[PDB]
Each structure stands twice: as C-alpha cells, then as structure tokens.
Amino acid sequence: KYALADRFSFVVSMVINSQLVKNDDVDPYKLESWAKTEILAEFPAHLS
Amino acid sequence: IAQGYYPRLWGNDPLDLISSSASPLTITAKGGVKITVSKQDIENKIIA
C-alpha cells in the first residue's frame, strides 16, 4: 500500500542535517513540531 | 502543614536547586528547548 500511495503529485522533500538537533537540552521531536507550526502559516496550501 | 511547622520552599538552598539538573522547576521555550542558568546569574538578577 505504500507503493499505491501517490508520492509525486505536489510533494516536496526537505533534507535536513541532523547536527542541528544534536544538543543535550534540545528535544528534537518537540522542537520539530514547533517548527512545522511556525512554518505552516506561510506554506503553500496545495503542497505536502 | 502540620502543627508547629512552616513550609520552606525548595530546601536550604533554593537557587542552587533551581540551577541543578534535578530541578523541580522546568522552563521550556520553542516547544522543545530546555533553559538552564547558573546560580550566579539568578543571584545577580535578584534585587535587594
């Protein structure tokens, strides 16, 4: 079913270095969720 | 509070406990970034 899902129509891949979240006091998953919330407002509507 | 006793906040040394890694006070910004400050910084900002 992963192969049946459309993966090329209006999809963008963001490849990010993981050194940024390498820190003792940084929770990557909570920080990642916040970044998506901040970006969502200006993100294009018809994109993933 | 039991008779003959009064509540003391965060033990003998409060500021040391707050600056500790096992601090009961947890401050988080940007969703997943932990904030830690040395005891001297908190002492400087306290006004007599």
Give B19→chain A minimum CA distance, Å: 14
Nearest-CA residue of chain A relative to B27? A25
How far is it, in rounded angstroms, from Cα B43 to Cα B14?
Answer: 11
Other C-beta atoms within 10 Å of B23: how many?
13
Run of H or E including A38: helix A28-40
Across the A:B interface, residue pairs with CB atoms under 8 Å apart total 27
Q: Is B10 within 8 Å of B18 (Cβ atoms)?
A: yes
Please name the amino acid found at residue A4: L
CB contact under 8 A, B34 and A27: yes
C-beta of residue B34 within 8 angstroms of C-beta of residue B27: yes
Contact call for residues B15 and A7 (beta carbons, < 8 A): no
Q: Do B34 and A26 count as a contact with CB atoms less than 8 A apart?
A: yes
Rounded Cα–Cα distance for residues B16 and B9 (Å): 12
Spatial distance between the Cα atoms of B36 and B21, rounded to a whole number of angstroms: 8
